[PDB]
Symmetry: C3
């Protein structure tokens, strides 16, 4: 009562959160934040990326000109979205290395088509069919020109088209495989058939194959689709003695941030940077567990479903410096205006006051970590395919291995980051507590002794103004030293 008590302490909360550290699988901190995005809003937002809903059409079909896809002529996109309900409703076709054509078009991001006046003298043009109905009338692929005999003849062709432009030209064309020699003759006069299209730096030579294939919408014949790119100064040369499905011009081909994604998520009227096939996801967090397939500024895909980053000190209700959860027995739930503070007992009563500077010092360091982690995601656009409908073997093994390797390495980085950061956050908060204790100890000089539990026995009368002077660093120890020394060193 000719003394006072001044206790240093830290807050605590009733609702702590369990986090992982380097040394401990489960340690409770006052607060934490989730680093793995685990949910989607279920819609693909139409902003800020130019979305193109394929709806009933695949990219290839819109490219070829299946009547169902006429509304897609000359469209551009940042992301083309293919629905699984999609289906082709024209002449049956295949594409050798389909995936590569789909990819290069997707990545180009435009269906811009220019018509070119090819010299088809000696042949019938605009071939038409019952399996490809447009406006209730028999039609064909809008971008392709089906050549047939004219007056029962079909001469050799040797037509050229030069690229005298400042850009690349993308040609799409194909070969017809009739189901019967009857049809071969009926359509092309001759029995055989041969197609050869060349440039200065390439040649693709195709030999038709008459034969039966299982009928698709009642058609047993097939078209095989091919592409060739012609650069400025180069020339397209197309030779044919049969079966040639002719281009009507070229597609502009670009390089940019365009791509394509398989999804059945509906398009919504909203704005979100990151798109997955499950829908758009917020990109505030650095990691996500929604889908390895993403487009835009996205958190990185990891295996974990949750990773909590501590944003507060260890919670001790009721560190390397040994203050928090050490010589200070527990935290103060009644301290809600700061993280660290003072409790005192003197002649005028018992009080509690937060220390702002130590509180702010810890908060700033924690916000420093958050600043490095939150809202810093990176943009990816066209990548590789990561889900597959058919067995292909080698190349598919490689593609899957690459993505699995990547994911394990990112999942490792995420796990280690959080464990290291959390160990460090618990240590820095213990350190700020220790610094406050140490600073106060030095202030008191010979006027007080450390009771070993964060409390100082102050060996002189110390009213509220006196305690206040200690808390704001204006305590003059010389004023009380004589009083304190006599109380300390007596019998």
């Amino acid at each position: 009562n000719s003394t006072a008590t001044l206790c240093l302490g830290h807050h605590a909360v009733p609702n702590g959160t369990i986090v992982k550290t380097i040394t401990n699988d489960q340690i409770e901190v006052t607060n934490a934040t989730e680093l793995v995005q685990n949910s989607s809003i279920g819609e693909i937002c139409d902003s800020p990326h130019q979305i193109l809903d394929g709806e009933n059409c695949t990219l290839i079909d819109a490219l070829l000109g299946d009547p169902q896809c006429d509304g897609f002529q000359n469209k551009k996109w940042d992301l083309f979205v293919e629905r699984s309900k999609a289906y082709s409703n024209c002449y049956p076709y295949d594409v050798p290395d389909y995936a590569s054509l789909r990819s290069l078009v997707a990545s180009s991001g435009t269906l811009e088509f220019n018509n070119e006046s090819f010299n088809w003298t000696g042949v019938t043009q605009n071939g038409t069919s019952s399996a490809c109905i447009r406006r209730s009338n028999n039609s064909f692929f809008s971008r392709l020109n089906w050549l047939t005999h004219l007056n029962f003849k079909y001469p050799a062709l040797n037509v050229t088209m030069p690229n005298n432009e400042q850009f690349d030209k993308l040609y799409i064309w194909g070969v017809h495989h009739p189901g019967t020699d009857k049809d071969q003759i009926f359509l092309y006069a001759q029995s055989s058939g041969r197609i050869t299209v060349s440039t200065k730096r390439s040649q693709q030579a195709v030999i038709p194959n008459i034969g039966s294939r299982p009928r698709i919408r009642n058609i047993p014949s097939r078209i095989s689709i091919y592409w060739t790119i012609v650069k400025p100064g180069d020339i397209l040369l197309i030779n044919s003695t049969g079966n040639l499905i002719a281009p009507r011009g070229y597609f502009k081909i670009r390089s940019g941030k365009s791509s394509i994604m398989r999804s059945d998520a509906p398009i919504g009227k909203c704005n979100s940077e990151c798109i997955t096939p499950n829908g758009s996801i917020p990109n505030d967090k650095p990691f996500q567990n929604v889908n390895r397939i993403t487009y835009g500024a996205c958190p990185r895909y990891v295996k974990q479903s949750t990773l909590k980053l501590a944003t507060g000190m260890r919670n001790v209700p009721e560190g390397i410096f040994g203050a928090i959860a050490g010589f200070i027995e527990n935290g103060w739930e009644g301290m809600v205006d700061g993280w660290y503070g003072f409790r005192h007992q003197n002649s005028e009563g018992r009080g509690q006051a937060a220390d702002l500077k130590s509180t702010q010092a810890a908060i700033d360091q924690i916000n420093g970590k958050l600043n490095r982690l939150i809202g810093k995601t990176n943009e990816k656009f066209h990548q590789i395919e990561k889900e597959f409908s058919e067995v292909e073997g080698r190349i598919q093994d490689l593609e899957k291995y690459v993505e699995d390797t990547k994911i394990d390495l990112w999942s490792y980085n995420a796990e280690l980051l959080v464990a290291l950061e959390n160990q460090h956050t618990i240590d820095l908060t213990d350190s700020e507590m220790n610094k406050l204790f140490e600073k106060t100890k030095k202030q008191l000089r010979e006027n007080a002794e450390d009771m070993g539990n964060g409390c100082f026995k102050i060996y002189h009368k110390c009213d509220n103004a006196c305690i206040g002077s200690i808390r704001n660093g204006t305590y003059d120890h010389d004023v009380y030293r004589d009083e304190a020394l006599n109380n300390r060193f007596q019998i």
Copy 2:
């Protein structure tokens, strides 16, 4: 002698181990554990994975039905093991994209075969040869049907088989390349030859090639092998005007954890989760240096041959807090019952006692690290090939680049992990020493002074019970304070 001495200290061992840290390439700790598995027991354990020793046969040969491999019919496996002594002893064949077929079968993990009744009217069946001897009699691939002319004719074929099942069908078939036009005629009547097998979504068209190839076991002709997968609702259509080696049915194809590995390690009767081509390896450690090729729950392959994780404090025989290898000059080899402790000298003699709580605190943190690192390996099954017998160029460059990239990134993670963990382990053990010293200092209050080497000069008579009271935290400093103050502050 009207005083006592109490010294704080830590153990040390005669046999220290050198580890790496962030700041030091070679620092000695009391104990460490090896994180890189560097040895195999030389055998592939037959448990707990279903092992299939190919012995004399490659997977493809067991698939085709080389008489040598009859015992393999309809077998399943988790891991198929190909021996290098393996060799084919039937009709000479090649497979275009051999590696992809080998892969998809390996990954499927079953040789389950169902026979199908194909309508081969107009042809001779069960063709047979001298290069493929079964039961001492001329035979052929058990799963293939060699068609030849019947009565010197060989009509067009147009046979269908539909998939009306709930699963995929895998068809294996092939084309015969006779060495002479003589043989072409002798076998198939006609001079030419043509094979076309189709589904609703595919077509593979093959044209035979008569010609001589260097004789393998005296045969200059060859079979080329092909495969096609037919899904539910789809149909196989096979057209042929020559040279068709016919399937006798389909293989069930599955998806699972199956794979294949090249090794000459004998199969042992033992249980081990992780298999390498050198033999099975323990998977307690997180890393391994045995082989980049693995199967099962395996440590990750890294380049280092050794990485030691400190599991004890710095060894100081004869840190950031400056206690261990700092103001405490050395450790105590005579302390074998704890890591940290007390030595005293008083009127009753000199003694040493371990402090359990500080010892346990360091041990728990170290076990926390071990828990994150030991026995936590991850399962990989079918991957990519990582050793190659032939030059292939581009794709092989990519496969090698991917694995080399992966390995360097894991080797980096391993190196950094151990350096960080070791720096931290040395620091946390120094910290526990410091906390014990600090706690003891506070206990003694004004009754003792810090001599600067971890020892306290206690300024009062302190018998064994008194020293004991300090060690178990029951020391009442008020009892001795008058005695201590008078001894401290005299002349």
Copy 3:
């Protein structure tokens, strides 16, 4: 004046450097070092790697024997350098899977050619042309043998060459595609044409294709190039009924550290381990931002343009322990002979002296980090291509994805490394300051008090020798204790 003052402190500089840490985006340290190499000297040094400047020739052209490339016969290289000004000046040719052939030759690293005596009876040899002029005379590819009819006939060929050597043989050959049936007849008698070259383990069957292609230097015909590798015990068998461009022997094929790089950097007379297409770069730093394409012992490519590693303490002009930028208000710019030191004031004046041991302790730890980071780069030779002139789709997507994945993971490692190291460097330097303060405090025992700003009020007369005794650890506190106690505990 019956007292002295002894202040503990650390240096500071006028020219600090901003670095990143875990908790702070911008913190000033006394010194830092750059970890990202951002510049090239613009030349490719001809040492210590054997450089081969392709100059006007591509690797393939030197391989085939384009007259322009005669000087390259049988050359070896560590790194072949292709110039963009390069051009072919012989018979127009293409290579299917050009990139794979270029790669395997590059990786082999030799143009060693042995001539082989093939039995070409029944044919004319040494075919020659106007598009391939050597010594002012019509010539051909030096390594190829253009076969034509002899006396208007051209029999079937069935020539063998066996590998009875201890090494692999690499055969290069090709097929001629005449522009007219006229030329086909003129050159090869027959109308058709067929080439089939085989080994015991392979067969490549080619069918020529008569037709027009856009003329390259006035030639509309083309040669297609192929390769086959024959191992010891195996045999080359080449059948042909037309159009065969024959090999004149084989290339030795090796395995080693050879590769190829596209660059327009001039070759310089200098020595540098690391080569990029921009020129050689120093490899002292662990990372580089110059080019993802490298050869030799190179720093790793990362995205950042700069990463500064702190090599000094926090700069405080005018940490977890709270000494530097904590209870010590600022550093001393006037201390240029050490990092930590003593300032005193006594009867004889005011002085400053560096403490070497604490200075050396921090410097050693920092050099420990530098030793792990500086001059430890790793050797890579032949890798994958990373820049592309044509759209290819799938495989190119995979190659680009792999490199982009790798780069992001290394850029992550670099960013985290520096942030962790810097946080730790700032903390260890604060720790050394704290240890020095703590050690000094203990030395002084009851003779001094901590004023709270790193300074001790020493309560006795302490001349220069006395202060000196404190700095070199020979201070005997017992000598002054009576004097000090009386001054401390008075009124």
